[PDB]
Every structure is written in C-alpha cells, then in structure tokens.
Amino acid sequence: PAMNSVFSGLDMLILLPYERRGTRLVVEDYRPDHIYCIGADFGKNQDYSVFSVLDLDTGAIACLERMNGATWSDQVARLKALSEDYGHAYVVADTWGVGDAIAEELDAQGINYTPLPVKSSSVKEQLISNLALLMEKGQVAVPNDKTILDELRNFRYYRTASGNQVMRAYGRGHDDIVMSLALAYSQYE
C-alpha cells in the first residue's frame, strides 16, 4: 500500500471463493433464516453499476453483480431479481443524481429500498470510515476477485484546494465497487 491508502486493514479482509455466473459473482445461495440487504450504485453512460448482496447475520457478501453498458431499466430489473433471489432483500441505493427515470422505476417496480444519497464528501467519508473500521476488525468478507481487491487497494486519500479531505481511486480509476460495498456495510451492526 501507498502512504495515502484508505484501507489500511486490507490484511484483515476475509476472501471468499465464488462462482462467476455472467455478471454475478455468487459466493453462496440464499439462506432463508438470514436477512439480507443490497448496496447499489448506478452508472451513467459507460460507468459501472455494482450491486453487493450482504448477509446481515454473518457480515459476508453472498453475491456481487457488476456491469456497464446496461440500460436504466435493465439495471433496475437486475436489482429486482437479486432482491427477490435473496428473500426480498432491501436495497440501500445511492439516489444522488440518478435521474427521474430510475427514481420513478424503483417505485413503479415495487423495489424494496432505502435512499442513501452520497451527496457530499462528508457522506462519503462516513460510509467509507465505517467500511474501513469493520474491515480492520475482521468483519468484512468479499469475493476473492482481483478486480474487487484492486479497487480497494487503489482507494486513496487526497486534499482539495480548500484543505478538505477527499477519498477517490488512484490515477484514473473507478470506485463503484468500493461504494457499493460501503452502502451495504452501512447497515451492518
């Protein structure tokens, strides 16, 4: 890790085997005695959308779905299917700047969701610090997928011109997986 790495506890991250089924990485199938939620961010244009299914009873990711180039309606339909697959798991959705169509469609399609708009650096910092703390404590368990691990590894601290802290991917990288995981783990006690 570089000096400015956010996830200093990456050594305590539990790595899980999985089966790749198209856009899903499936660690385990639905356990009906457990309660699940899904962290969801939505991509515009060629950006990725990432849905992270978290078993709230074990603290482990059961399934992670990631894709780009999907229509807005297809993003919502895939989220609905994942929710239904995991017992009508509730969605923690980053609703900031998602647009009228997706907002209307979540409601119109009866998706079980709670809004968590990542509307400022302050909100992002709360989400991230919670994930990072849980990680150091050995409570975060994710699919052992190099893309996921690399995105976590490359998430770094910077400062703005006014001196405020910001967190973002190194170089010209992405953080859609990081934020999806943080949205899921925001619910974990």
CA-wise closest residue to 186 among 51, 7, 39: 39
Q: What experiment produced this structure?
A: X-ray
CA dist., res. 151 & res. 128, Å (int): 13
CA dist., res. 145 & res. 153, Å (int): 12
Beta carbons within 8 Å of 79's beta carbon, 6+ residues apart: 38, 40, 51, 91, 111
Resolution to 1 decimal place, in Å: 1.2
For residue 189, count other CB atoms closer than 10 A to its CB. Answer: 6
CA-wise closest residue to 153 among 132, 139, 137: 132
CA dist., res. 124 & res. 74, Å (int): 26
Q: Which domains does the chain have, with CATH numbers?
A: 1-189 (3.30.420.240)
